[PDB]
Design a protein around this nucleic acid. Sequence first.
RNA 1: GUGAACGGUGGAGCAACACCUGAAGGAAGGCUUGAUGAGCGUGUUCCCCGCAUACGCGGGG
Lengths: 149, 234
Amino acid sequence: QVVWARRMDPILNLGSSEDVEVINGGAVAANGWIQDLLANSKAGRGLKAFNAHEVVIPGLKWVWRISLDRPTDAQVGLVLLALNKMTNERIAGGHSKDYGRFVIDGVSLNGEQVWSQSGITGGEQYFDAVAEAIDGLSSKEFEQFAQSA
Amino acid sequence: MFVKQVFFDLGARIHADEARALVAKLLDDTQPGLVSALMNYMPASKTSKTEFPLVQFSNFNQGFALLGFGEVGAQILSDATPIIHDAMAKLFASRGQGVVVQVSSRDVPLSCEKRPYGLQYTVAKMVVQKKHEHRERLANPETGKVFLEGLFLRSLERQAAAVGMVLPRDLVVSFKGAERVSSVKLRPDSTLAHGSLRHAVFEVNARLGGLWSVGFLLSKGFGHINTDLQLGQG
RNA sequence: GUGAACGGUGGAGCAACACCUGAAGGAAGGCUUGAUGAGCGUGUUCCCCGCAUACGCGGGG
């Protein structure tokens, strides 16, 4: 669906002078801004533009493939720990519009289903391996990975 | 071509002729070319032009509106809108707590096409009386119907020739009915008045696609309405 | 009647073998489709502009 979003000019919708008493100067600064907007409109970018953005419709089922090139089980456990609390994050999206929200309907580990409503059930050796690898995870490997010769 | 329509929101409604007199009184001390532009005066004297005036006042629910016809009227309104808005801002910031003046602007194109079926148009607060001969025409409906026919057709032709676009000359108009008859006074507390028609309905085979002004006292804010709202009314 | 006259540069031969364009990398941060144009006051002869050339027509407020 093409979803249309428009930005309103704020001081085009004041109405009363009680809303402008927080603006320094008062009505005079808003009137000068209105004069500048008029000089822009007769002829520097303005505000309250109208735009559209195509989005994928919600409620449909997707598919994701995460392949591994001969992994250690700590790495598989790292990917499954990402998949366990994946629901807190967003896929791409417009952050303001709360786009990219999703639930995981399933996780197939080499063809077998390991996902339930309470996260990932199964693949226990990957979780013990990543629990062993998270312990003792120091900065020293990151330092001499990022160090440039 | 195209016309321009600029609305000034003040928070309180002031009439079109009263706003005309107000911007005549307020901008008079300074900038004489600009008021000579907006009240369509002669370049040398204070007398207004006898031709079609390009910029005319209109009706706004929260203030007053200005209409600039053609490129010249649009340019005049474009150079005059910030000065008018600043004058209103200083005038209503001098007294009271002070209000904020809102603006709006529209560029409505003009178009006309001839169709082989009648079309309905209602005009509110149109002035048709100027002389004693028109009053003698108004007493008898048979000689007054043709007068309204010629007045509507000549107003349409004058506006089409003033804006700079060609109008087909085979248009057959008709005048069906009237709701009220009232009077219009150019200056308050004056004995002289002009007869005016309230909620006239007219029927013309052609269609119109913008603001069209008919009748006399067009500048004062009389006898104009948008045909774009009235075609497909709602 | 050219110190002329006459006289084959010929036969055969593989540019071919092997070689990862590849590693890493967020299209995003913000943004009311909501209005705007729809209805609301004046009660009788006062200036000025053209066609005429005044018998009158159009027309500015």
